[PDB]
Amino acid sequence: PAEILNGKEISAQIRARLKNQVTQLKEQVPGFTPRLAILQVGNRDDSNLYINVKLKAAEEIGIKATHIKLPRTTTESEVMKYITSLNEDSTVHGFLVQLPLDSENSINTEEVINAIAPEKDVDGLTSINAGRLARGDLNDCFIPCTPKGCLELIKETGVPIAGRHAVVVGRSKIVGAPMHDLLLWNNATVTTCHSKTAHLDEEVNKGDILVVATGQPEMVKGEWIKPGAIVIDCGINYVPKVVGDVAYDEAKERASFITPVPGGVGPMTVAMLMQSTVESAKRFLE
Amino acid sequence: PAEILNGKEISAQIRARLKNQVTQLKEQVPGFTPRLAILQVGNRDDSNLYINVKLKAAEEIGIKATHIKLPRTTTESEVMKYITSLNEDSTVHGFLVQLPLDSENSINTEEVINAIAPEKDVDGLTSINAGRLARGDLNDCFIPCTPKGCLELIKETGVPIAGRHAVVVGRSKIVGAPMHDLLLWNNATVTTCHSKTAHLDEEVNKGDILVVATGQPEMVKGEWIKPGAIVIDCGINYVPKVVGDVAYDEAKERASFITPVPGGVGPMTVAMLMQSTVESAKRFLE
Ligand SMILES: NC(=O)c1ccc[n+]([C@@H]2O[C@H](COP(=O)([O-])OP(=O)(O)OC[C@H]3O[C@@H](n4cnc5c(N)ncnc54)[C@H](OP(=O)(O)O)[C@@H]3O)[C@@H](O)[C@H]2O)c1
Ligand SMILES: NC(=O)c1ccc[n+]([C@@H]2O[C@H](COP(=O)([O-])OP(=O)(O)OC[C@H]3O[C@@H](n4cnc5c(N)ncnc54)[C@H](OP(=O)(O)O)[C@@H]3O)[C@@H](O)[C@H]2O)c1
Ligand SMILES: Nc1nc(N)c(NC(=O)Nc2ccc(C(=O)N[C@@H](CCc3nnn[nH]3)C(=O)O)cc2)c(=O)[nH]1
Ligand SMILES: Nc1nc(N)c(NC(=O)Nc2ccc(C(=O)N[C@@H](CCc3nnn[nH]3)C(=O)O)cc2)c(=O)[nH]1
Numbered sequence: 001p002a003e004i005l006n007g008k009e010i011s012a013q014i015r016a017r018l019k020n021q022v023t024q025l026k027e028q029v030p031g032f033t034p035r036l037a038i039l040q041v042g043n044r045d046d047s048n049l050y051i052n053v054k055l056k057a058a059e060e061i062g063i064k065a066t067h068i069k070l071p072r073t074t075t076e077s078e079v080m081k082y083i084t085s086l087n088e089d090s091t092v093h094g095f096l097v098q099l100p101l102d103s104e105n106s107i108n109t110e111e112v113i114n115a116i117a118p119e120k121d122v123d124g125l126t127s128i129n130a131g132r133l134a135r136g137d138l139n140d141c142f143i144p145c146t147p148k149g150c151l152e153l154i155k156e157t158g159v160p161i162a163g164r165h166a167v168v169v170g171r172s173k174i175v176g177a178p179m180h181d182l183l184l185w186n187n188a189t190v191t192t193c194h195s196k197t198a199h200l201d202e203e204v205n206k207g208d209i210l211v212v213a214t215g216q217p218e219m220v221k222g223e224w225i226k227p228g229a230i231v232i233d234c235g236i237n238y239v240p241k242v243v244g245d246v247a248y249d250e251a252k253e254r255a256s257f258i259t260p261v262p263g264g265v266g267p268m269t270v271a272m273l274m275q276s277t278v279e280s281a282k283r284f285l286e
Numbered sequence: 287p288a289e290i291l292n293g294k295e296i297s298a299q300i301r302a303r304l305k306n307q308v309t310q311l312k313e314q315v316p317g318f319t320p321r322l323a324i325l326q327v328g329n330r331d332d333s334n335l336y337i338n339v340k341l342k343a344a345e346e347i348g349i350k351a352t353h354i355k356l357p358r359t360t361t362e363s364e365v366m367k368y369i370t371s372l373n374e375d376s377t378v379h380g381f382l383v384q385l386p387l388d389s390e391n392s393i394n395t396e397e398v399i400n401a402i403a404p405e406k407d408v409d410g411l412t413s414i415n416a417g418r419l420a421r422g423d424l425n426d427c428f429i430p431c432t433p434k435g436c437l438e439l440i441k442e443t444g445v446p447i448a449g450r451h452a453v454v455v456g457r458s459k460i461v462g463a464p465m466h467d468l469l470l471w472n473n474a475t476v477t478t479c480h481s482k483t484a485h486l487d488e489e490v491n492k493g494d495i496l497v498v499a500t501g502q503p504e505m506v507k508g509e510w511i512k513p514g515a516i517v518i519d520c521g522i523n524y525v526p527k528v529v530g531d532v533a534y535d536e537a538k539e540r541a542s543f544i545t546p547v548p549g550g551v552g553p554m555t556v557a558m559l560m561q562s563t564v565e566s567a568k569r570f571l572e
Binding site: 110126127128129130131132134135136137162163165171173177180181184187188189190191192193194196197198203 | 396412413414415416417418419420421422423448449451457459463466467470473475476477478479480481482483484489
């Protein structure tokens with residue numbers, strides 16, 4: 001059986017570090033506090049939960065997080081006006097738009113996200129930030145929070161990444177595609193799979209490192225895992241309880257390290273958002 | 287043995303269609319013509335060679351191509367002046383900076399590259415354009431010219447890309463990394479290899495599609511190629527004569543299709559730049 005990677009516990013460590021960092025930065029600079037804005041469109045249930053988990057994490061740490069909930073009937077132009085105000089508000093060190101936008105109207109997500117000024121783009125979702133990470137300019141961009149969390153879980157095994165074959169299953173903007181970029185510039189040999197991949201099972205079996213972000217509940221079977229592999233499960237799936245994208249019970253039999261769901265990637269996602277907001281708060285001072 | 291993908295003959299088809307496309311624009315909109323500008327730093331022999339190749343092709347087509355050559359001793363502040371002038375020059379539709387800069391002063395390539403207006407970045411080197419491509423927003427960006435030209439070559443086989451396993455060897459900003467993105471959003475399963483990649487012979491042996499962009503003369507041996515593979519060699523290596531990054535003889539015995547070196551990717555890169563130039567000039571009329 002595989003050692004469980006304890007995200008709920010690993011993240012506690014990070015949030016305690018960040019809180020101390022924020023208190024130092026308030027003693028060192030009086031009246032100053034990191035400020036975060038989360039913009040939501042519509043009223044999705046799951047967006048409400050993740051937004052509010054982020055609100056909690058910002059409160060435990062010392063970050064000032066504001067939440068703006070727009071109606072499902074809002075227009076693209078209305079959303080831009082908010083982005084516009086946030087860009088120029090020199091007190092806001094970072095904001096994000098929780099995705100997907102739940103509007104009855106037709107709104108260009110890419111247009112909205114790309115209007116975020118890259119210095120405040122703590123979610124790493126602008127083309128600008130994505131283009132730097134996609135070309136290995138890793139020390140001047142914000143890296144998407146879920147991939148940041150995943151790398152950290154990988155490093156906690158002690159297993160060096162360089163030279164290992166990583167499989168990433170999923171190519172989403174927020175997770176799968178930046179996760180491939182992060183592993184590549186960490187000198188893994190990376191294979192990216194998706195819904196047109198044939199013989200997925202055999203591709204998954206080459207993975208020394210395996211990151212699954214498909215949103216298909218327990219679709220990746222344990223037999224597919226390479227014996228001794230590091231498995232990272234980004235799935236959060238609500239079924240008849242919460243399951244990940246990997247059939248956890250059989251995968252823990254062949255993995256050497258595995259992430260449970262819940263309590264794995266998800267808390268680490270939240271923590272890395274907090275880290276990026278402290279970083280952009282610092283970068284403002286300097 | 288393998289059909290040869292003839293870069294000479296294929297690039298000549300596209301240039302002529304570009305040419306007649308230009309001629310009809312000039313009849314439709316009297317006086318107008320597409321203008322390209324190439325900026326060079328230093329006096330590298332090879333960059334002189336390739337820039338002149340682009341000048342000749344633009345001449346055949348009806349693209350007015352200016353070449354500006356700055357000395358090795360120029361400062362980053364000097365290059366910045368010229369880039370800003372090209373950005374602001376309304377009769378220039380696209381311009382590129384031939385890489386790598388050749389300078390005694392240590393000049394920040396990424397600072398220089400990213401000042402180019404993205405609407406004129408016909409080489410697809412701005413971070414804005416790298417991130418649109420890396421995330422699948424393929425309708426608003428200039429794809430880099432060499433990957434464009436491998437993609438055109440692979441399409442000449444008539445064998446669909448979706449579903450096949452593609453192995454990209456190399457992760458450079460100009461070829462390797464953007465080739466992965468192109469193949470990925472044409473729905474291949476893509477493995478990207480580099481120098482910390484172990485057992486390259488075996489990662490290669492997975493390629494239904496194999497693109498090699500190492501600059502390591504004939505380092506991919508023919509014996510590693512999967513039988514029936516489509517082989518694309520981006521190499522140009524001067525040795526005891528020009529050779530590619532693949533062992534051509536043995537590889538030809540196993541591939542279904544293969545690019546000769548020279549006469550393969552090289553003329554396709556030039557033709558793609560001209561196609562990108564004509565497209566940015568079209569977008570300017572409107
Ligand atoms: N976004 C959120 O709010 C959120 C929150 C918590 C957890 N997550 C988790 O994060 C992960 C991904 O984020 P997302 O929801 O933004 O992604 P998404 O848009 O739902 O895309 C899922 C990815 O998985 C691929 N996929 C679907 N079925 C597949 C199959 N049978 N075989 C292989 N690949 C398949 C899709 O491939 P194609 O590209 O070919 O369609 C796609 O690239 C999921 O595990 C999800 O549960 C997301
Ligand atoms: N750039 C030009 O003007 C030009 C002109 C003519 C032809 N070309 C050809 O086009 C390609 C372009 O290369 P570039 O100059 O753009 O980039 P580059 O800086 O030469 O990088 C070459 C890439 O190949 C990888 N590589 C090197 N040795 C390797 C090995 N033994 N095993 C696996 N991977 C290895 C390197 O991996 P790391 O990232 O780990 O180093 C790197 O990513 C080359 O094939 C070159 O001959 C380029
Ligand atoms: N812009 C933008 N848009 C997005 N959609 C995202 N993604 C995102 O926010 N993901 C996300 C995933 C997990 C969790 C979390 O807290 N997981 C806990 C408890 C789960 C649980 N479920 N039921 N009870 N508990 C656990 O997995 O352990 C929080 C947020 C983004 O990052 N940026
Ligand atoms: N910004 C920027 N910077 C860059 N460095 C590049 N790269 C680039 O331009 N590469 C390049 C390589 C080959 C050729 C070509 O024409 N090849 C012919 C003849 C070659 C030959 N002639 N004599 N010996 N070999 C052939 O190989 O058949 C054309 C362009 C870029 O695209 N953009």
